[PDB]
Design a protein around this ligand. Structure first.
Ligand SMILES: Nc1ncnc2c1ncn2[C@@H]1O[C@H](COP(=O)(O)OS(=O)(=O)O)[C@@H](O)[C@H]1O
Ligand SMILES: Nc1ncnc2c1ncn2[C@@H]1O[C@H](COP(=O)(O)OS(=O)(=O)O)[C@@H](O)[C@H]1O
Lengths: 176, 174
């Protein structure tokens, strides 16, 4: 049994949002659930191609992802969003529009993300090669009341996915 | 019942929006699950910021196709109303979506220009607006649409009826 819902992963670059998204996607698909993934890194090559990382463009980006997530959710689809989405007021705006919405705070310390520097972006932010990088010289406003929080430096992947899954069960979006 | 994109293409003023709304009502009143993506409306949200250059119309149509695809493959009936003047781009979206009906809303340029519903034809003729479809920008008519509605020669009910019957024939609806 399946009801529409947007599962919204927010957090720093490198915090592990994509990894959780993919593991959660697999778990859901293997149970027969109907889903769509909207990953910021990927949709910025199509749906939101042309946008940069100014405040205006991040707002446009998140609002556009929210638009598509809303249409899918209200038609019964489970939508997995993975996007830095650093502005709380914008996340709240999307949550309010969609209603069936779960905010997942993928919470890793800045220092941990910077040490791994998976795509080399932190070093480029520090040197000034890149301007306005989230967490270094651009805001990240952490969720104050997320529905699920995953402290990825302190919990195993299965534990993080498990908490999202259990929340979906508790709220009866998927079968227990 | 089955997902499908119903894609209305045609000149400004040809009657696309009127057919869309009438079709939407008929589908909803029969219990069907749908979404409408009207070019005039999505250009205030989904495609806000784009103009009417070739590259912007391509971006516009491709982005509408992106959303239509995700909805269609999840069982939703999607009604698109957009000038979509480039045949190759309509074909590209049709190919991506698969379950796609191209509806040619075909009114003569002269009929659309004489009504000039939004005053845009007069603005195109004076040069107030540049690159207006059918006046100084292309419209490439479908050569093999799934349904054609000659709105200057058909009653609204007849145009809607043909789209409905096509949906029935192809088993998208009961
Ligand atoms: N200035 C930047 N700030 C954050 N991420 C950036 C920046 N420049 C490039 N990126 C890349 O863009 C990705 C973030 O895109 P989004 O999740 O779509 O951002 S968001 O702020 O608009 O939500 C990061 O994973 C990173 O790879
Ligand atoms: N240069 C223009 N050409 C066509 N339509 C225009 C133009 N400028 C403003 N408009 C308005 O924009 C609408 C067309 O938008 P679309 O259907 O989204 O066009 S499309 O070519 O990109 O598919 C028309 O109904 C008309 O009202």
């Amino acid at each position: 049994q399946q009801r529409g819902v947007t599962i919204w992963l927010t957090g720093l670059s490198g915090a592990g949002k994509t990894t959780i998204t993919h593991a959660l996607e697999k778990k859901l698909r293997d149970s027969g659930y109907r889903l769509e993934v909207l990953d910021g890194d990927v949709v910025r090559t199509n749906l939101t191609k042309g946008l940069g990382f100014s405040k205006e463009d991040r707002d446009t980006n998140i609002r556009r992802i929210g638009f598509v997530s809303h249409l899918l959710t209200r038609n019964g689809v489970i939508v997995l969003v993975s996007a830095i989405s650093p502005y709380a007021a914008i996340r709240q705006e999307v949550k309010h529009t969609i209603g069936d919405f779960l905010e997942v705070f993928v919470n890793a310390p800045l220092a941990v993300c910077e040490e791994r520097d998976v795509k080399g972006l932190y070093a480029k932010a520090r040197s000034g090669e890149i301007k306005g990088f989230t967490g270094i010289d651009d805001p990240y406003e952490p969720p104050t009341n997320p529905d699920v929080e995953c402290r990825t430096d302190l919990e195993e992947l299965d534990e993080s996915v498990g908490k999202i899954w259990q929340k979906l069960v508790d709220l009866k979006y998927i079968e227990g």
